[PDB]
RNA sequence: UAUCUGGUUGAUCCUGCCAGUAGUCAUAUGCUUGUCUCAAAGAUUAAGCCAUGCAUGUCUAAGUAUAAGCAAUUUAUACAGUGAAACUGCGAAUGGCUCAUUAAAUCAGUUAUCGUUUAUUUGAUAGUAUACUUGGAUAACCGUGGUAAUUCUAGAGCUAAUACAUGCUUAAAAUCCCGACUGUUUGGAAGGGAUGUAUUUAUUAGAUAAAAAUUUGAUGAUUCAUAAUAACUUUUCGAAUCGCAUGGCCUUGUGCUGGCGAUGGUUCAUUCAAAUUUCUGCCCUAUCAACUUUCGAUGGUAGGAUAGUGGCCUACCAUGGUUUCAACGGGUAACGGGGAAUAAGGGUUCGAUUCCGGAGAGGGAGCCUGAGAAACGGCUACCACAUCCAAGGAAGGCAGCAGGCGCGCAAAUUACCCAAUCCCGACACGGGGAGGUAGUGACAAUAAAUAACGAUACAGGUUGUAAUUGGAAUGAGUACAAUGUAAAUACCUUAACGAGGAACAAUUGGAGGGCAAGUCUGGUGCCAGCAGCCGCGGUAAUUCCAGCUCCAAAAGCGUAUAUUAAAGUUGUUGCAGUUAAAAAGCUCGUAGUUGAACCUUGGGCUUGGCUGGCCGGUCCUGGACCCAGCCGAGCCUUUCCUUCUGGCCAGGACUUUUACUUUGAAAAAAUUAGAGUGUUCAAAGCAGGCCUUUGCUCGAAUAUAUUAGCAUGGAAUAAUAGAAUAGGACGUUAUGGUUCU
RNA sequence: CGGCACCUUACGAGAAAUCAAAGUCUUUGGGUUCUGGGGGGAGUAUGGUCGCAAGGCUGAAACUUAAAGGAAUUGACGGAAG
RNA sequence: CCCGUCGCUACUACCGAUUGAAUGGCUUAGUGAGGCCUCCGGAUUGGUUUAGGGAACCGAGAAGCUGGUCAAACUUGGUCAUUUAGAGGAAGUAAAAGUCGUAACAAGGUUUCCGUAGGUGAACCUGCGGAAGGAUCAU
């Protein structure tokens, strides 16, 4: 079937190579998972040595890390917005490694407000204004307020990340290989890497 | 399969088949020692030709060379042991001087005749082939058996031979038994 | 081709087993075990070809199935078990203890040892590293894994294994002046002291060894086994000959005097 | 044995080939064939086609036994011995065969995996935040069958597990997060969550130049080993198993405890492996000079896939990559190598084939299972062959062993056995056309009969024969028997038999030359024929056909073909080119090849070793002194020989590039050379030897490999670089300034 | 000093004719290019390439054959000389 | 001594209309078995199992279906390579010395030979320019 052998190629000098031997099983390839977004569907693959691989054919959620905050949460994946390899993966919402996706921001917002006491997005709407006061008026003990007060000053995050919380969706890049491990994990875009992909998206 | 078993030829024929000088020398040499055919002369010349080749290779090496001293002494010792080389000629230069008659002297057939056990050299071969001659306490029926120096004194009739104290042979038992 | 080989042709067997050409088509293929195939001695070869206790391969299996043969203090019933360097073979029925140490001719000597010495063995440290939960361990030349070693032990050192508990009694650091036996190459079986270790980053380190007769030879560090803390003080009994290589002329002279 | 000889002429000397000559682990064939040992053998042509039989199965006390199997009554009314059938486990990926494909491919030597998988073996390794032990299937079995037909299987009724699917039982703390309340200068806290190990991410340890105003492993090197934090997971596994013993404590309750083992299990290491991989090296061909890049060719980025690296594949992007130092294409009556034949040296030719590596199983392709296969004595499909059929269907793969057909110049028994060598399995026990044994076997190789000795008679120069007269000797063969062997055969031993024409009868080629041995006799008459070549044969043929005699080799000898030497007729060593074949018509010219001389020489001092002796010191042999000679040193001469710390070994910092040569390591075993060793000798084999041993004891050496790579010494020879617009060298502690850790 | 040559000798070379190079080549190595491997078939066939063509350059094989050939000697012959 | 046409016989190779023939490799295009992955599907078969008749809703899951992927094989075409037929044409060699002459070897009776170009039954002849391997090392 699909073969990874180098015998079928022509040499560096351009010479066609004669047929040496029949295709061997230890040089096989298989077909791409083409992971989509949908209710979870994972198929196991029996690989060399009796080991196991997992084809993620469909996933909804994944484990995403906030690198600056050192916190990881499981959150939904909304869709694929950019792919450096093929634009057809963006059009068809195909999850591969290094794909830029939008993830649900609520688990990280919940951690942030509970950890610092402030709010994110900074929108001025009525719901945003009511929620901003709601978090600031939350009932806490004296020790908790002091614990939050110690964490203050470090609670100011980058503007380009804070701004995203208003839409309820953060930009992230997939770090795992869904067709190899069945996981669709990644990290939240930050710093100049986020600035790089922001220019790509707006164009 | 099993490992191959080594074998090799023990003679080599002359390059020129017809040469009166060589033909007369061979026949003269075969008649003196009662040899069956020319191959028994080729065999001596062949094995003497490779003794010389070994000696020539060592003689090209420098004196006091470890290989020349070791293999040269071993080659001399073997030739002295079978009586081909004299005890006063252990120099590896006298090895090259050896001649085919030196080796034919040391055959069992030659020694049986020269020890008086046979009337002629041709009587010696049939005595050997007919299991009458024993070296030590072992019967040897190979005429080309090369007698060693320590085996020289123990050549005699087999103890169970008619000529050496055994019973009378087939012919006599049939005659005196009639 | 499609999987592991299970046969060993007689001609392709290691030459130090000293097997004859014409006894058959095959040779005992050593099992997987503590020692490499090329550097081992199957118990069938030891019990039949060396000791000549068994007359054939059927009889050596009968011997081992009665629980007589012990390698390193444990009963082995595998006739092709790969016994190797420094291994102790015990036959308590005959009250005999052997250690597999190379003689100077390159073969495994039939070296009988006392019961007190048969209670331990030496192993060359191949690597030191940390296992799971951060527990350091040592891998010896015979595949042993000893946990919690002395933190001073490094590679190329020699440890003394208690061989009944498997622990380390004490060790010898690899350094100049240590007693050494060579376990590979054409200098296999020779015994001398380290004179100078010559390093080659990215390549093979070379060790200069001086014989007791002040003969100097060079060998790879991978073929060097420290067996003593200094000259004349080995931690195991050496085989007859003391690992001193004689020239062929010297051997011929020695044999002449021995036989008269 | 480092060799030549015949043929051009009336004669000569040459060039030159033809012919002769010898070998072949080199094939065929002809004639002939007594003995012993050893032993190749359907490769060549057709990797052409195959009837038939066999070639792979497997159970221990220790997975599962209600056989309606056998056996016995026994510690046993849960089972208990043995044990078909089945389920489960493992093996069937080894072996054996063949050489079609294959020309930087395979392969050889040498590397790498800090680029991966690994059943098994061997070491380690798991207290993790209904339990006196969970379920429901299924086989074998029983009995209803269907088909012409297969190692086809369908309904129905049972029943088990180390099968399948689930599931508890546990240390002691401690740490982290959230945190009601509380203290109230930031502490205390109830209560909640989280901890083993695997998986997948993200983020942190993972340090390490010496004084002044707490730990931290390895490597040449890592984002390594390992640890930590936050989470994650169609939630990995942390024993619902099996045999033998049955012990100890009493709180005498089926109380609590516990001994040696089977099997299994996660991870790491190890071993057996595998997959990729660095460098260098392949025969002929230019009547093959340009090739590769649509549709991957060279590279980059990202991904996918893979066990993993990698254009391995995809997307986007660059326009690259190889080549007269022969790329690319073509041929190969090409698998590569270890090796074989011949060989003064250098070489030439061969290598299907006992070992190693590769590839294939009629031709392709695709897969299942499994640790491992793109497996074919596994499956699926097509093509080509081909079998049974009741015509509906079904079953195939001898380049395994034996055997058949065909092809051909060309190649053996449809035999016996697991006794040996080893392999496989649950295994002391089963299996093995693997392997061994015998059969056929003038493939090659070893040893080695076919007669020996007397007396007469003569010839003869004290004895060599030529004849007719004797008594001895012996194995070829036959055989009691014993040995041999798994059982035999044969060998080896050995009763009785077994030689005068010892008919127990040696052949194959020749007799002009080369080339050894007839000018004998008969036959034919340029016929028949011979003759490798030159030649012979037309009526006394030394050559034909025969008889006699003789020569050569001999259990072997001839013929054909190929190949090697001869061939210095392929010439590097080592040819020839005025006229024998052959200097381009003449210049230019790129690659290639090749290129003047020159740079530390001489001198002095001290010293080590080995050769000769003198000493002599002689039981051939050993010492300073002495002489010379030959090698190595170490200092001094204006003096190269890296440089610092610990203090020649161990720990740092620098370094013109080679070629060459020395030494060392490496180049598998077998083969070659070679040491030892009375296989009765020998070819061989790796044995063997000792006063005869309730054991003692030498061995199984050693060289050679040779290009490439590795380490090392030397610095001639041959290249290479340097300070010319000085952008040059030293300042070790030169004077400041700019920085970096 | 450079040329075109010549005469004598043969140390030397060669099969010889002859050669101051055709010497310094079995006492075999200064550098380098081209060409030949018994006589014919044959510079033919075929392919390529150049040319307007004639042709040039490159260039086999089947088959056939024991000589073909070089230099010199003696003779014979010559419609060669003396 | 000797050369070449022409005539007879035999053998070898060559050219040659036949868009000749046959076999094998590579390949464009078309068609395309089968496996694998994927997509639904849902024969029947167990209950997360809930339900006063049972309605559910959880799992397993065969045939089959969708789209891919590897891709045998066939048809057509092209090309390469290897064998082979062919009326006729034109050679070579061997055999014998058949017919015609006498071109070469002597100054071979016109010295011979080379390149080139014409001519001619055949050897060959002639022109132009060369060579001596000449019949002259010389006036
Ligand atoms: Mg090809
Ligand atoms: Mg695993
Ligand atoms: Mg391999
Ligand atoms: Mg085993
Ligand atoms: Mg390394
Ligand atoms: Mg002539
Ligand atoms: Mg004549
Ligand atoms: Mg010849
Ligand atoms: Mg011959
Ligand atoms: Mg056959
Ligand atoms: Mg065969
Ligand atoms: Mg029973
Ligand atoms: Mg197993
Ligand atoms: Mg195999
Ligand atoms: Mg090529
Ligand atoms: Mg284990
Ligand atoms: Mg049923
Ligand atoms: Mg299980
Ligand atoms: Mg990549
Ligand atoms: Mg790339
Ligand atoms: Mg692409
Ligand atoms: Mg070959
Ligand atoms: Mg082939
Ligand atoms: Mg081969
Ligand atoms: Mg072949
Ligand atoms: Mg093989
Ligand atoms: Mg076949
Ligand atoms: Mg097939
Ligand atoms: Mg297959
Ligand atoms: Mg088969
Ligand atoms: Mg097979
Ligand atoms: Mg069959
Ligand atoms: Mg024979
Ligand atoms: Mg006879
Ligand atoms: Mg005759
Ligand atoms: Mg005759
Ligand atoms: Mg005659
Ligand atoms: Mg003669
Ligand atoms: Mg003849
Ligand atoms: Mg003649
Ligand atoms: Mg007559
Ligand atoms: Mg006559
Ligand atoms: Mg030759
Ligand atoms: Mg010549
Ligand atoms: Mg001429
Ligand atoms: Mg000429
Ligand atoms: Mg010229
Ligand atoms: Mg120079
Ligand atoms: Mg110190
Ligand atoms: Mg070898
Ligand atoms: Mg080398
Ligand atoms: Mg001369
Ligand atoms: Mg002159
Ligand atoms: Mg001149
Ligand atoms: Mg020719
Ligand atoms: Mg002439
Ligand atoms: Mg047509
Ligand atoms: Mg197509
Ligand atoms: Mg072709
Ligand atoms: Mg004329
Ligand atoms: Mg005229
Ligand atoms: Mg004329
Ligand atoms: Mg005219």
Which tags fit this structure?
part of a larger assembly; 3 chains; A: alpha+beta; 3-stranded mixed beta sheet; 8 strands; B: 178 residues; mainly alpha; 46% helix; binds magnesium ion; RNA-binding; ribosomal protein (chain B); cytoplasm (chain B); rRNA-binding (chain B); rRNA binding (chain B); Ribosomal_uS4_CS (chain B)
How are the elements arranged and paired?
This is part of a larger assembly, with chains A (203 residues), B (178 residues) and C (260 residues).
Chain A: E1 36-37, E2 41-46, E3 52-59, E4 61-66, E5 71-82, H1 87-91, E6 100-104, H2 106-116, H3 126-136, H4 142-151, H5 159-162, E7 169-174, H6 178-181, E8 186-188, H7 191-202
Chain B: H1 20-33, H2 39-60, H3 66-81, H4 100-105, H5 108-114, H6 121-129, E1 133-135, E2 138-139, E3 155-157, H7 170-176
Helix pairs in contact in B: 2-3, 5-6
Chain C: E1 41-42, H1 43-50, H2 57-65, E2 69-71, E3 74-75, E4 82-83, E5 88-91, E6 96-99, E7 111-113, E8 121-124, E9 127-130, E10 136-139, E11 145-147, E12 158-161, E13 168-172, E14 179-182, E15 191-198, E16 206-211, E17 216-220, E18 224-230, E19 233-234, H3 248-258
Antiparallel strand pairs in C: 1-4, 2-3, 2-5, 5-6, 6-7, 8-12, 9-10, 10-11, 12-13, 14-15, 14-18, 15-16, 16-17, 18-19
Chain C binds 3 RNA strands through helix 2, strand 9, strand 10, strand 11 and strand 15.
Q: Terminal Cα separation of chain A, in Å?
A: 41 Å
The gyration radius over C-alpha positions of chain B equals 20 Å
* Overall spatial form of chain B: globular
What hetero molecules are bound to the protein chains? Answer: magnesium ion
Largest interface: B-C, 7 and 10 residues
Q: Quick one: how many beta strands of chain A?
A: 8
The oligomeric status of these chains comes to part of a larger assembly
Which structural class fits the helix and strand makeup of chain A?
alpha+beta
Helical proportion of chain A, percent range: 25-40%
Strand order of the largest sheet of chain B: 2-1-3
Biggest β-sheet description of chain A? 5 strands, mixed, barrel
Helices of chain B, by number, come to 7
The count of helical stretches of chain A stands at 7
Strand order of the largest sheet of chain A: 4-5-6-7-8
What's the story with the biggest beta sheet of chain B?
A: 3 strands, antiparallel
Percentage of β-strand residues of chain B: under 5%
Order of helices and strands of chain A: EEEEEHEHHHHEHEH
């Amino acid at each position: 079937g699909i073969s990874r052998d180098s015998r079928h190629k022509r040499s560096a000098t351009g010479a066609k190579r004669a047929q040496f031997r029949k295709k061997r099983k230890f040089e096989l390839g298989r077909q791409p998972a083409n992971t989509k977004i949908g209710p979870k569907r994972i198929h196991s693959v029996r690989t060399r040595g009796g080991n196991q691989k997992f084809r993620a054919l469909r996933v909804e959620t994944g484990n995403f890390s906030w690198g600056s905050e050192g916190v990881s949460r499981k959150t939904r994946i909304a869709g694929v917005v950019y792919h450096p390899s093929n634009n057809e993966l963006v059009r068809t919402n195909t999850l591969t490694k290094s794909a830029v996706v939008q993830i649900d921001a609520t688990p990280f917002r919940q951690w942030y407000e509970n950890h610092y006491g402030a709010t994110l997005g900074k929108k001025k709407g009525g719901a945003h204004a009511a929620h901003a006061a709601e978090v600031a008026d939350a009932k806490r003990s004296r020790k908790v307020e002091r614990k939050l007060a110690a964490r203050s000053g470090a609670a100011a995050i980058e503007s380009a990340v804070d701004s995203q919380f208003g839409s309820g969706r953060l930009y992230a890049v997939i770090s795992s290989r869904p067709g190899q491990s069945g996981r669709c994990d990644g990290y939240i875009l930050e710093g100049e890497e986020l600035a790089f992909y922001l220019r790509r998206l707006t164009a | 399969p099993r490992a191959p078993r080594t074998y090799s030829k023990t003679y080599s024929v002359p390059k020129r088949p017809y040469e009166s000088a060589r033909l007369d020398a061979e026949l003269k040499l075969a008649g003196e020692y009662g040899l069956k055919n020319k191959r028994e002369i080729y065999r001596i010349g062949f094995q003497l030709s490779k003794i010389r080749r070994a000696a020539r290779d060592l003689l090209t090496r420098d004196e006091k060379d470890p290989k020349r001293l070791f293999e040269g002494n071993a080659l001399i010792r073997r030739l002295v042991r079978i009586g081909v080389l004299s005890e006063d000629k252990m120099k590896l230069d006298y090895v090259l001087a050896l001649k085919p008659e030196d080796f034919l002297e040391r055959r069992l057939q030659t020694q049986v005749f020269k020890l008086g056990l046979a009337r002629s050299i041709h009587h010696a071969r049939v005595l050997i082939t007919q299991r009458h001659i024993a070296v030590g306490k072992q019967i040897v029926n190979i005429p080309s058996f090369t007698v060693r120096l320590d085996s020289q004194k123990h050549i005699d009739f087999a103890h169970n031979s008619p000529y050496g104290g055994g019973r009378a042979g087939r012919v006599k038992r049939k005659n005196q038994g009639k | 081709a499609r999987g592991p080989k299970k046969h060993l042709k007689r001609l392709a067997a290691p030459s130090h087993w000293m097997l004859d050409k014409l006894s058959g088509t095959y040779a005992p293929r050593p099992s997987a075990g503590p020692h490499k195939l090329r550097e081992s001695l199957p118990l069938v070869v030891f019990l039949r070809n060396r000791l000549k206790y068994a007359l054939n391969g059927r009889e050596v299996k009968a011997i081992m199935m009665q629980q007589h043969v012990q390698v390193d203090g444990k009963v082995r019933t595998d006739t092709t078990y790969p016994a190797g360097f420094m291994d102790v073979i015990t036959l308590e029925a005959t009250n005999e203890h052997f250690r597999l140490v190379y003689d100077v001719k390159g073969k495994f000597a039939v070296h009988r040892i006392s019961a007190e010495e048969a209670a331990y063995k030496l192993g060359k440290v191949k690597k030191v590293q940390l296992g799971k939960k951060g527990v350091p361990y040592v891998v010896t030349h015979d595949g042993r894994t000893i946990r919690y070693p002395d933190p001073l032990i490094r590679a190329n050192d020699t440890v003394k294994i208690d061989l009944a508990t498997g622990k380390i009694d004490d060790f010898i650091k690899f350094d100049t002046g240590r007693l050494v036996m060579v376990t590979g190459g054409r200098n296999l079986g020779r015994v001398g002291v380290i004179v100078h270790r010559e390093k080659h980053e990215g390549g093979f380190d070379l060790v200069h060894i001086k014989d007791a007769l002040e003969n100097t030879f060079v060998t790879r560090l991978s073929n060097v086994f420290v067996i003593g803390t200094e000259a004349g003080k080995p931690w195991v009994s050496l085989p007859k000959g003391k690992g001193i290589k004689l020239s062929i002329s010297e051997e011929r002279d020695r044999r002449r005097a021995q036989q008269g």
